[PDB]
Symmetry: C2
Subunit: 293 residues, 2 copies
């Protein structure tokens, strides 16, 4: 049976402060530890990517759940998706509010409806049927995010391969700062924000949402592998095309069916981390290979 | 410069009794002929697919705009998207209510905003801001679909086009499926799934079970194949082939390559479709019941 792997990513975004890397690092390391621990007891791929995306949602440092950017009204609106590479089962929520873990809600859509995607008010309806807690907007808005906005006036993801050779992906975000109300970016859109398939691999993406959607980056990446490119070569084709075709920047993380993995990005910085073989590989900048504490 | 062409379709579901067949064939002819009228008259492939689908939305016999299927909670929530192959420029909307024409809001999303996709409350407010009229919910509603939602206690409309300047586009629009959960979103607004447009390959607009079409990203898979060497019909067959086996989904698509070539195919029992090219109307519902007239 396969040796399991988890890869995580924060945003494929701008350059970070020298002091705050410390802080961002430990965010990647932590969510990846939650993912690799899960695989380390025969959790499934969906378990790992969800608990890993769960970690970063909870973390007010990352642009997802608590920590989400604000829309044009000072308000957090959230998208996410999760996908099962064996049978292509999937779940996604878009433009949801007053909840803590949009990724946990995306799994609930997937596991307990015959639908794959719920939006806005029907998505709240679904959450409360599932007895998901309402929290105050305040509890998701950093003092920080209000400043990022008023000047103008991040994504998190995970891929894993488990003990049985299943792949999966999770991606969650608060979107782009100042976005129109009800703007949906790539995150809850299969093939854009992520894709996962046992006959190929899994991908979660980050960066400019409209650009990712337009070139179908996640599924695109995996086409290149399907043609026998390396996971390195594949991700260099998709992001390079995204740049030359739509002037969009981003980054991505991928695991192929046989367990090869990479983080590549064309933006300034894509914070990432990976666990495989009791060893952890951490970076923010264009990499520590280190024991699993 | 190329010979312009539009292809239009309706839902990809089951058997259709002869009495409904006629108005459906009727409406598909208005759609093909409206879109073509724009292409003949110098217009863009984006303009032209916007054309074919507004006719399909305003026409009651098709699950998009007027005559959209009802969600579990007796309301209309509509999905639409539109793409320009020129630059891959796109606009989209999900869970829109109480407007006549979702595809127009979608194009307004491609042109008037920095985004490609708005939904529900957000999409309603942009529609206020662009001067989209706020039309009472019940006029979208129809007895056929009232009967149907009652009995439950499915349709999509689309077009692709090639223009006389070489450019390609698709538009897709839907009400979803019968007794869907509130705020359910299917394939029809998701680029790569409910449709894909790329001047360097061609354009495709899908029909059928939204959830499957999303799982396999049906429209972009037909294109990958057309890139690889496959003819439009082989690519149709194979992508359509894979949704059936891998995820046990049925549906359809229309496609039109950057070379002039077009096809319409389905794995559902039926799919109302018409193409217009070189001064003729093509149409059909069930496999090779092909009839061609001359289009004035
Ligand atoms: Na967070
Ligand atoms: Na990002
Ligand atoms: Na209609
Ligand atoms: Na349909």
């Amino acid at each position: 049976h396969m040796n399991p792997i988890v890869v995580v990513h924060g945003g494929g975004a701008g350059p970070i402060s020298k002091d705050r890397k410390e802080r961002v690092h430990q965010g990647m390391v932590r969510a990846a530890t939650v993912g690799y621990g899960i695989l380390r007891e025969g959790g499934s791929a969906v378990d790992a990517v969800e608990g890993a995306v769960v970690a970063l949602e909870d973390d007010p440092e990352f642009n997802a759940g608590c920590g989400s950017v604000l829309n044009t009204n000072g308000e957090v609106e959230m998208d996410a998706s999760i996908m099962d590479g064996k049978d292509l089962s999937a779940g996604a929520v878009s433009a949801v509010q007053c909840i803590a873990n949009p990724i946990k809600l995306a799994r609930l859509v997937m596991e307990k409806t015959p639908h794959c995607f719920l939006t806005d008010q029907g998505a709240a309806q679904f959450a409360a049927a599932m007895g998901v807690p309402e929290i105050p907007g305040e509890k998701l808005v950093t003092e920080r995010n209000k400043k990022r906005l008023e000047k103008e006036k991040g994504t998190v993801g995970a891929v894993a391969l488990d003990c049985k050779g299943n792949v999966a992906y999770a991606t969650s975000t608060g979107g782009i700062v100042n976005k129109m109300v009800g703007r949906v970016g790539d995150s809850p859109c299969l093939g854009a924000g992520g894709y996962a398939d046992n006959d190929i691999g899994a991908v979660s993406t980050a960066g400019h949402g409209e650009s990712i959607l337009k070139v179908n980056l996640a599924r695109l990446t995996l086409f290149h592998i399907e043609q026998g490119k390396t996971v390195e070569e594949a991700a260099d084709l998709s992001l390079g095309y995204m740049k030359s075709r739509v002037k969009g920047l981003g980054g991505l993380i991928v695991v192929s069916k046989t367990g090869d993995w990479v983080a590549k990005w064309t933006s300034t910085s894509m914070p990432w981390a990976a666990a495989k073989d009791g060893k952890l590989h951490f970076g923010i900048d264009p990499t520590t290979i280190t024991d699993l504490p």
